[PDB]
Amino acid sequence: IVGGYTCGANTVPYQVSLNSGYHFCGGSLINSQWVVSAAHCYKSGIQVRLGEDNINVVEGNEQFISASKSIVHPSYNSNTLNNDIMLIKLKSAASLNSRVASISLPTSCASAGTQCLISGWGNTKSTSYPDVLKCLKAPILSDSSCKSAYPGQITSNMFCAGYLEGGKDSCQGDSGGPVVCSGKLQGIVSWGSGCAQKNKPGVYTKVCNYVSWIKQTIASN
Numbered sequence: 001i002v003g004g005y006t007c008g009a010n011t012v013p014y015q016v017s018l019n020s021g022y023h024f025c026g027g028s029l030i031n032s033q034w035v036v037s038a039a040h041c042y043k044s045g046i047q048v049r050l051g052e053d054n055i056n057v058v059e060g061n062e063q064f065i066s067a068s069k070s071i072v073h074p075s076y077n078s079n080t081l082n083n084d085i086m087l088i089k090l091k092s093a094a095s096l097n098s099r100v101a102s103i104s105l106p107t108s109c110a111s112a113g114t115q116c117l118i119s120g121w122g123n124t125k126s127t128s129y130p131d132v133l134k135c136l137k138a139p140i141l142s143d144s145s146c147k148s149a150y151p152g153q154i155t156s157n158m159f160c161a162g163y164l165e166g167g168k169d170s171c172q173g174d175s176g177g178p179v180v181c182s183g184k185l186q187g188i189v190s191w192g193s194g195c196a197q198k199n200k201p202g203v204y205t206k207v208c209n210y211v212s213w214i215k216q217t218i219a220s221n
């Protein structure tokens, strides 16, 4: 996160860190045994780390649970980044409490202008990687502004959020993490040209398009 602020320990209780020897992506806890992340975060040997603030220090609220299964969206295209979403099932159910909690899925999509909270352990410079969780409040941008910023690249499964002036954005290492708006998971950190650059806002997977797939996948897995 570039141009954000220190969230505060465990104030974003649905935020997880995906670890394969080191933090490599964010994700969002959506029930006791499932995490949503970006498809481009797929790899084997994932340990999900819940209850994290400082990802380099054991502070006492963590739960470390290995993934039992990953499910990349059937239509994910790694060239265009369309359908950049993946589900991860935990080998055991997380113990839910005030510091480790699921985030609600949307029942309707969010509109341009809505303020959201974006969070992660990604780069803070447009190189410096933080140990504690960083946060950014940012608005969803209009579809037209998003398409104007990235001609020919924005599909109906993507939205832009942030600040066209630059200076405030998600970044490398934030990928897969949450965009939460009024208590609903509306986005997943997906892509963008550099970070916090003028006229290059962050691009996010549009979660509301995937709720039926998420629910039916969980129901059968």
Ligand SMILES: C=Cc1cc(C(=O)Nc2ccc(C(=N)N)cc2)c(-c2ccc(C(=O)NCC3CC3)nc2C(=O)O)cc1OC
Pocket (backbone or CB within 6 Å): 040, 081, 084, 169, 170, 171, 172, 173, 174, 175, 189, 190, 191, 192, 193, 194, 195, 196, 201, 202, 203
């Ligand atoms: C969707 C495909 C896609 C995206 C990213 C990526 O950049 N997304 C990103 C997120 C937001 C913003 C923004 N809002 N401005 C911009 C871009 C990457 C990727 C490539 C390189 C590194 C890296 O160098 N990390 C640091 C180093 C420890 C490895 N990280 C990533 C990552 O997943 O974030 C890899 C992808 O498919 C292989």
Ligand SMILES: [Ca+2]
Pocket (backbone or CB within 6 Å): 052, 053, 054, 055, 056, 057, 058, 059, 062
């Ligand atoms: Ca920790």
